[PDB]
Amino acid sequence: HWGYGKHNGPEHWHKDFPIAKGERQSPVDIDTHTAKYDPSLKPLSVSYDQATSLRILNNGHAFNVEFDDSQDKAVLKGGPLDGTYRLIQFHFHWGSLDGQGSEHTVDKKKYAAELHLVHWNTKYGDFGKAVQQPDGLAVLGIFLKVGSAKPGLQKVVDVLDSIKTKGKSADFTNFDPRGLLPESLDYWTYPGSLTTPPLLECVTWIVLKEPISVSSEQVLKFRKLNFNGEGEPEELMVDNWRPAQPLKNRQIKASFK
Numbered sequence: 001h002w003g004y005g006k007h008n009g010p011e012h013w014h015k016d017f018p019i020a021k022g023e024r025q026s027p028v029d030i031d032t033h034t035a036k037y038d039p040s041l042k043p044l045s046v047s048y049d050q051a052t053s054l055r056i057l058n059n060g061h062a063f064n065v066e067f068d069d070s071q072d073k074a075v076l077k078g079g080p081l082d083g084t085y086r087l088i089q090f091h092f093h094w095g096s097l098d099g100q101g102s103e104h105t106v107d108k109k110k111y112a113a114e115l116h117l118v119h120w121n122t123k124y125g126d127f128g129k130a131v132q133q134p135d136g137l138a139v140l141g142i143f144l145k146v147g148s149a150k151p152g153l154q155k156v157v158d159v160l161d162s163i164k165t166k167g168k169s170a171d172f173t174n175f176d177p178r179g180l181l182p183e184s185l186d187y188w189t190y191p192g193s194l195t196t197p198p199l200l201e202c203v204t205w206i207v208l209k210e211p212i213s214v215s216s217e218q219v220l221k222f223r224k225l226n227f228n229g230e231g232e233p234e235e236l237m238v239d240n241w242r243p244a245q246p247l248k249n250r251q252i253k254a255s256f257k
């Protein structure tokens, strides 16, 4: 099936997933000088106080930290969003080197990695139903650059030896995602899609202006992960990011001047 190499990567996806060339695909380049400040965007509201993490999983494309979304525990509201979006999982996209790895770009700048915190609109009852709606998902995108360590990431970095290969997972309870946020909640927002197949155009993207810093030793451990399953030839999990796609008939709004 699909992945990130020469033969199965982002240039091939359209063959099985023709929406890949669609109206509202992600990621995109964020041109800071074309984005329109919108004084009527409400403040963004991140409520991760009661967040219940369960498990970390290597799915052969990335690793997912999954949350209990059986009630309104950790939710995203405000900003450009209507109603409540429940957190289900976060994951990253990262590079083989520090100059690449993020999906969105800022004035063409690629960051070392990009965090995605994935939320579904509760008005739709479950995740499977929400992916089928234009306002079904809200994903909070946060850029990572390399510098000093993010202490709130270290617990994630430590568990990765135990989920090296596709299909492995470990228990991952009592992890707090507020430790992955920057100080500022300033953001750009546009309507878009999942950046992995099935590339469903159901996402309101909220991309934070301010990056988090991670140590070099922290990203190096991401890069020690494996695309392959146990006992297969080693393909390092690196460069699992889709490049930027045409903006087309869309506007990126900024929460800030």
Ligand SMILES: NS(=O)(=O)[C@@H]1O[C@H](CO)[C@H](O[C@H]2O[C@H](CO)[C@H](O)[C@H](O)[C@H]2O)[C@H](O)[C@H]1O
Residues within 6 Å of the ligand: 059, 062, 064, 088, 089, 091, 116, 118, 127, 139, 193, 194, 195, 196
């Ligand atoms: N990069 S992304 O956030 O657009 C992309 O979207 C999917 C999530 O909506 C995908 O999901 C993984 O976890 C979800 C949520 O439960 C699904 O169940 C799916 O089967 C699983 O792959 C990607 O992980 C993510 O890259």
Ligand SMILES: [Zn+2]
Residues within 6 Å of the ligand: 091, 092, 093, 116, 195
């Ligand atoms: Zn993602």
